[PDB]
RNA sequence: AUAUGAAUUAAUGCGAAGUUGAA
RNA sequence: UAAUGGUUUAAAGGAUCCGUAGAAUGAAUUAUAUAUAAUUUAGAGUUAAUAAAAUAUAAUUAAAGAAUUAUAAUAAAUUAUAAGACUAAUAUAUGUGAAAAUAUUAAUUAAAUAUUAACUGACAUUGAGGGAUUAAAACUAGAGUCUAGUAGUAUGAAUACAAUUAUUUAUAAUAUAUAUAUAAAUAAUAAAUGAAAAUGAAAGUAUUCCACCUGAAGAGUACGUUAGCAAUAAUGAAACUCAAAACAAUAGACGGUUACAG
RNA sequence: UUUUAUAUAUAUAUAAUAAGGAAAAGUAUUUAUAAGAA
């Protein structure tokens, strides 16, 4: 699904900062402080390097990566800046968390608590997208196509019966 | 217009009467407001006041969507001679089985016949019927030849 | 119990009347031939032949 | 005392002296009635003491 | 991610006990830095007697050099650090505990915190630039 | 009971309310931005002490 | 398949005064 | 000729949750003809911020520890080896989890709280069928004793409301004192309910959805089917016999039932 | 409550002030109908 590909690529970009930071803004703030004193070059460079190493995705927790991914998904699907609850945004955010959970269970398969958590999340997405179908037919098909799902997946009854996992080779 | 909300209101008035509270509150919806007005005009409730969840309104407040969530209708209960005036309140038309009666069967009910397993009107009793989104006493509904849904029974 | 459960089949127990003379196939009487005549003792407290 | 001053006992997991201040001669964690700490403070003190025992300090 | 390592190194040379601590610290710091890590602090806890005669491999120790190294590093790399420590003859014991950086980015070591220094800024008293 | 229960808001009121709500949200963003910038500021302040250079690793090992 | 009969055969109900265990 | 019935204890709440259909039920305002359309935010949700150990819950990996067992040595004892299982205080299962369960340490991943702000705009409740996990036991295959299994046993949920007191518990204040207010937990109540025992913020007042019960025994038996190599499990009667049978409580004599006296 | 007055920085703290008083005599049909005992 191209959307998921781009979102999961943004995490693995060569340099992307955590905790809400980006390279441009940190650069601005660092240069501004450096200028402030005016009114050895090696040390400031390696100090900058240490800062950037501290704030790196590769350094931070996976939870932070998923937080950033959810932010990107919301930014993409939002009706207007700041929108968070329109069913498109809800579907996208739950989709990202579903991807993360599916990875989690795929790694180790006896974790039944998180398995039922994931099933509940999937069924929640089904419910919200069904409501979207009823309310906004156009945005509904737009959304299921972007997220990589046909109407069959949303409409039908779904559970992760192990036969599902055998069918789609989930493990 | 929920019969669920109206049933909750009916049970709330019953409980408030049993523990002898002078003033209580109900949801501020037109069904509840029409209900409270019809009970009040018949002497069952002492008074109606506008208010919020905290209490009755001190000064007049306009009703807007901004404050609608916390709006409440404060009903004052009557207790006379150490007894509750509004002794009991019931819903004839349950949310499952809704009873929409034509005028002839309302006359039969008022005249003592049991229609659709509804116990007929009693002397000191009050029955409310909603016709075309207006609540009214069953007697007035018959007087205006209005077909309607029978809702409740307060004795 | 609930209106749908009542609708789906539940209800008061059928006050079912079974025949106390099943072999008479709903006839007031039936003719018959006596294979044997037998003397029996009733259940106590009663005693007799 | 000091963990009754609003400090976090988990922070005192690399300071075996203070952890020893709240154990019996044989090393037994002192029940809450003896220590008189809050619940939450007692739980972090127990966790910190058991961590200290785990890391060999 | 912050991780405090508390290592217990064996004293085999009685005249210069500290050398093994220096060599292990150098090796681990090289791993951390060369793997896109940072070693924020090294606290040299003194030489102390062990609570018991604790045994690693065949040799038995009674006293050791304790040290604390606070470092910001990634998960796989701390896993490899621990694997190296456990298989290293010099390290009697190791313990690597995460320090949550959720609320503040810069945080001190457990001992300096226990004194009352929740961040290394208070450790190195003041910076003295504003706005 | 005949009159409408509530007076629906005119679109001018809707625009004004939009302005107030967006002000609240943007103010929260502004506080969070101040906080992240201040944390970055303190991090860079004390980043002198941190050790990213092996040449400095040996220095501080010898010092300590 | 719907029935009707069957040597051979499974279980259980009753009752007669009792017989044996101590669950 | 009693369902103007019941399910803690008389027959009967399904182990726990998730959720499809429901010819099941379900927010607010306006307008039009019993719904439809447009608006709205009280239900249900989404994203952040803060506070808190979200520590306990799962899986995985990596460690620690007492002792046990066996082997070897020295003269039950002291050392040295390997093996596994278990987690001694804290300690209350306080808590966490839907239940079953779970308290030696660290880490990785996942999830669970509240309040505020913003956003969606009824997207909700329950849930037949179905699906997940399901102790111990039973055995089946692949691997060298282990893994992968078959199988599925052994006071329902939600919403509105409901007088006190006394303790705690967690916050919010005001200057230890306001014997401080707001909440939840615990105990005795009032009213109310009940056949009573007893319940007493639920076994109360109401609404909605599902499951279950219809005298005792025959019988959870037989037969058939369903899965299973099988074991077993699920579904599950009928004839005959009887006026019984059962529950709570009352007084009694009875027990090696308890003590205690005279 | 409301209205004003002073003071202070359109607003805030203080002081005063309050319009709701009317009387009169006479002017049935009720409806359908559910019992238990051993
Ligand atoms: Mg849902
Ligand atoms: Mg009848
Ligand atoms: Mg029973």
Curated annotation (Swiss-Prot), chain A:
It is found in: Mitochondrion. GO terms for molecular function: rRNA binding; structural constituent of ribosome. Keywords: Mitochondrion, Ribonucleoprotein, Ribosomal protein, RNA-binding, rRNA-binding, Transit peptide. GO terms for cellular component: mitochondrial inner membrane; mitochondrial small ribosomal subunit; mitochondrion. GO terms for biological process: mitochondrial translation. The keyword Plastid does not apply. The keyword Transit peptide applies. The precursor is processed in two steps involving mitochondrial intermediate peptidase (MIP) and mitochondrial processing peptidase (MPP). Component of the mitochondrial small ribosomal subunit (mt-SSU). Mature yeast 74S mitochondrial ribosomes consist of a small (37S) and a large (54S) subunit. The 37S small subunit contains a 15S ribosomal RNA (15S mt-rRNA) and 34 different proteins. The 54S large subunit contains a 21S rRNA (21S mt-rRNA) and 46 different proteins. Present with 6960 molecules/cell in log phase SD medium. Component of the mitochondrial ribosome (mitoribosome), a dedicated translation machinery responsible for the synthesis of mitochondrial genome-encoded proteins, including at least some of the essential transmembrane subunits of the mitochondrial respiratory chain. The mitoribosomes are attached to the mitochondrial inner membrane and translation products are cotranslationally integrated into the membrane. This is Small ribosomal subunit protein uS15m. The gene is MRPS28.
UniProtKB/Swiss-Prot annotation, chain B:
One of its GO terms (biological process) is mitochondrial translation. One of its GO terms (molecular function) is structural constituent of ribosome. Keywords: Mitochondrion, Ribonucleoprotein, Ribosomal protein. One of its GO terms (cellular component) is mitochondrion. Its main location: mitochondrion. Pfam families: Ribosomal_S8. InterPro entries: Ribosomal_uS8 (IPR000630), Ribosomal_uS8_sf (IPR035987). Gene3D superfamilies: 3.30.1370.30, 3.30.1490.10. Component of the mitochondrial ribosome (mitoribosome), a dedicated translation machinery responsible for the synthesis of mitochondrial genome-encoded proteins, including at least some of the essential transmembrane subunits of the mitochondrial respiratory chain. The mitoribosomes are attached to the mitochondrial inner membrane and translation products are cotranslationally integrated into the membrane. This is Small ribosomal subunit protein uS8m.
Curated annotation (Swiss-Prot), chain E:
One of its GO terms (biological process) is mitochondrial translation. The keyword Iron does not apply. GO terms for molecular function: small ribosomal subunit rRNA binding; structural constituent of ribosome. It comes from the Eukaryota. It is found in: Mitochondrion. InterPro entries: Ribosomal_bS6, Ribosomal_bS6_sf, Transl_elong_EF1B/ribsomal_bS6. Component of the mitochondrial small ribosomal subunit (mt-SSU). Mature yeast 74S mitochondrial ribosomes consist of a small (37S) and a large (54S) subunit. The 37S small subunit contains a 15S ribosomal RNA (15S mt-rRNA) and 34 different proteins. The 54S large subunit contains a 21S rRNA (21S mt-rRNA) and 46 different proteins. Component of the mitochondrial ribosome (mitoribosome), a dedicated translation machinery responsible for the synthesis of mitochondrial genome-encoded proteins, including at least some of the essential transmembrane subunits of the mitochondrial respiratory chain. The mitoribosomes are attached to the mitochondrial inner membrane and translation products are cotranslationally integrated into the membrane. This is Small ribosomal subunit protein bS6m. The gene is MRP17.
From Swiss-Prot, chain F:
Disulfide bonds: none annotated. It is found in: Mitochondrion. It comes from the Eukaryota. Signal peptide: none annotated. Component of the mitochondrial ribosome (mitoribosome), a dedicated translation machinery responsible for the synthesis of mitochondrial genome-encoded proteins, including at least some of the essential transmembrane subunits of the mitochondrial respiratory chain. The mitoribosomes are attached to the mitochondrial inner membrane and translation products are cotranslationally integrated into the membrane. Component of the mitochondrial small ribosomal subunit (mt-SSU). Mature yeast 74S mitochondrial ribosomes consist of a small (37S) and a large (54S) subunit. The 37S small subunit contains a 15S ribosomal RNA (15S mt-rRNA) and 34 different proteins. The 54S large subunit contains a 21S rRNA (21S mt-rRNA) and 46 different proteins. Present with 2010 molecules/cell in log phase SD medium. Belongs to the mitochondrion-specific ribosomal protein mS26 family. This is Small ribosomal subunit protein mS26. It comes from Saccharomyces cerevisiae (strain ATCC 204508 / S288c) (Baker's yeast). The lineage of its organism: Eukaryota, Fungi, Dikarya, Ascomycota, Saccharomycotina. The chain holds residues 160 to 223 of 318 of the full protein.
């Amino acid at each position: 699904t191209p959307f998921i590909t781009r979102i999961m690529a943004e995490l693995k970009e060569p340099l992307v900062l955590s905790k809400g930071y980006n390279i441009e803004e940190v650069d601005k703030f660092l240069a501004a402080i450096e200028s402030a004193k005016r009114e050895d070059i090696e040390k400031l460079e390696d100090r900058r390097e240490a800062i950037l190493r501290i704030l790196s995705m590769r350094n931070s927790e996976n939870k932070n990566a998923i937080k950033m991914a959810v932010e990107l998904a919301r930014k993409e699907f939002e009706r207007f800046p700041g929108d968070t609850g329109s069913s498109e945004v809800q579907a996208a955010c739950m989709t990202v968390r579903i991807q993360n959970m599916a990875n989690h269970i795929k790694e180790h398969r006896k974790d039944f608590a998180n398995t039922r958590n994931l099933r509940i999340l999937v069924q929640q997405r089904q419910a919200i997208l069904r409501y979207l179908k009823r309310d906004n037919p156009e945005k509904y098909y737009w959304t299921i196509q972007k997220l990589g799902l046909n109407d069959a997946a949303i409409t039908d009854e779904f559970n992760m019966d192990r036969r599902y996992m055998q069918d789609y080779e989930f493990f | 217009m929920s019969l669920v909300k109206l049933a909750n209101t009916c049970a709330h008035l019953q409980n408030c009467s049993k523990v002898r509270v002078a003033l209580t509150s109900i949801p501020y919806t037109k069904l509840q407001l029409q209900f409270a007005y019809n009970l009040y005009q018949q002497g069952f409730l002492s008074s109606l006041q506008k208010g919020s969840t905290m209490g009755p309104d001190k000064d007049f407040v306009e009703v807007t969507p901004d404050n609608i969530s916390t709006r409440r209708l404060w009903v004052g209960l009557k207790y006379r001679d150490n007894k509750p005036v509004l002794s009991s309140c019931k819903l004839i038309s349950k949310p499952n089985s809704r009873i929409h009666l034509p005028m002839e069967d309302m006359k039969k009910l008022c005249s003592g016949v049991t229609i659709r397993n509804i116990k007929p009107l009693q002397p000191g009793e009050l029955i409310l019927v909603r016709a075309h989104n207006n609540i009214m006493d069953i007697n007035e509904a018959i007087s205006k030849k209005l077909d309607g849904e029978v809702l409740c029974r307060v004795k | 119990a609930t209106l749908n459960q009542i609708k789906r089949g539940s209800g008061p127990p059928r006050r079912k009347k079974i025949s106390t003379a099943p072999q008479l196939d709903q006839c007031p009487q039936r003719k018959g031939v006596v294979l044997r005549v037998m003397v029996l003792k009733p259940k106590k407290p009663n005693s007799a032949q | 005392d000091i963990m009754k001053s609003g400090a976090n006992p988990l922070e005192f997991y690399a300071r075996p002296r203070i952890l020893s201040r709240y154990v019996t001669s044989t090393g037994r964690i002192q029940h809450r009635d003896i220590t008189g700490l809050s619940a939450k403070n007692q739980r972090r003190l127990s966790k910190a003491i058991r961590r200290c025992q785990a890391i060999g300090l | 991610m912050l991780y405090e390592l508390i290592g217990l190194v064996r004293i085999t040379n009685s005249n210069a006990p500290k050398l093994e601590a220096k060599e292990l610290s150098s090796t681990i710091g090289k791993l951390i830095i060369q793997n896109r890590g940072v070693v924020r602090d090294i606290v040299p806890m003194g030489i102390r007697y062990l609570p018991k005669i604790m045994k690693k491999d065949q040799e038995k120790h009674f006293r050791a050099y304790h040290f604390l190294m606070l470092f910001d590093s990634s998960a796989a790399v701390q896993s490899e650090i621990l694997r190296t420590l456990k298989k290293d003859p010099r390290v009697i014991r190791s313990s690597i505990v995460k320090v949550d950086l959720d609320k503040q980015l810069d945080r001190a070591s457990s001992l300096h915190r226990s004194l009352g220094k929740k961040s290394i800024l208070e450790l190195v008293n003041e910076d003295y630039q504003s706005i | 009971m005949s009159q409408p229960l509530l007076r629906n808001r005119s679109p001018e009121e809707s625009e004004l309310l939009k302005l107030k709500r967006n002000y609240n949200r943007s103010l929260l963003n502004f506080q969070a931005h101040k906080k992240k910038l201040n944390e970055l500021l303190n991090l860079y302040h004390v980043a002198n002490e941190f050790i990213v250079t092996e040449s400095q690793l040996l220095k501080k090992i010898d010092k300590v």
